[PDB]
């Protein structure tokens, strides 16, 4: 019965940072691993990044390793995903889900709980010099 619920989302200029968490109901937050996932306007859900019952073992996305961190705290019940860098295909709605039993990178469908989504939105002003 664990619920999820995201927020951090908004409009972002290219370069910017911006810094989702995901917290969780009850307190058994620890007997979840944990997974972001995003849907790009009118597209499939991907793979983001995930995160161990401990956050020994990370996982992320090929197009986003290196600028995006996952991180923990389980006295706030909550994952963060801090994103640096963002460029406008970083645009999507950002998903988090939790599972008691498997970790590791992608298995979308393995989830068992999912939250409602955060908008993230990576726009410049759209000034075109021609």
């Known amino acids: 019965d664990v619920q999820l619920v995201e927020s951090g989302g908004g409009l972002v200029h290219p370069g910017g940072s911006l810094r989702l968490s995901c917290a969780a109901s009850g307190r058994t937050f620890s007997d979840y691993a944990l997974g972001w996932f995003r849907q790009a306007p009118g597209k499939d859900r991907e793979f983001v990044a995930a995160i161990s019952w401990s956050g020994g073992s990370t996982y992320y996305a090929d197009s986003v390793q290196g600028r995006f961190t996952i991180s923990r705290d389980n006295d706030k019940n909550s994952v963060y995903l801090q994103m640096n860098s963002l460029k406008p295909e970083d645009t999507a709605v950002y998903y988090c889900?939790?599972?008691?039993?498997?970790?590791?990178?992608?298995?979308?469908?393995?989830?068992?709980?999912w939250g409602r989504g955060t908008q993230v939105t990576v726009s410049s002003h759209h000034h075109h010099h021609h």
């Open positions: 889900a939790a599972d008691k039993y498997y970790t590791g990178p992608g298995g979308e469908s393995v989830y068992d709980y």
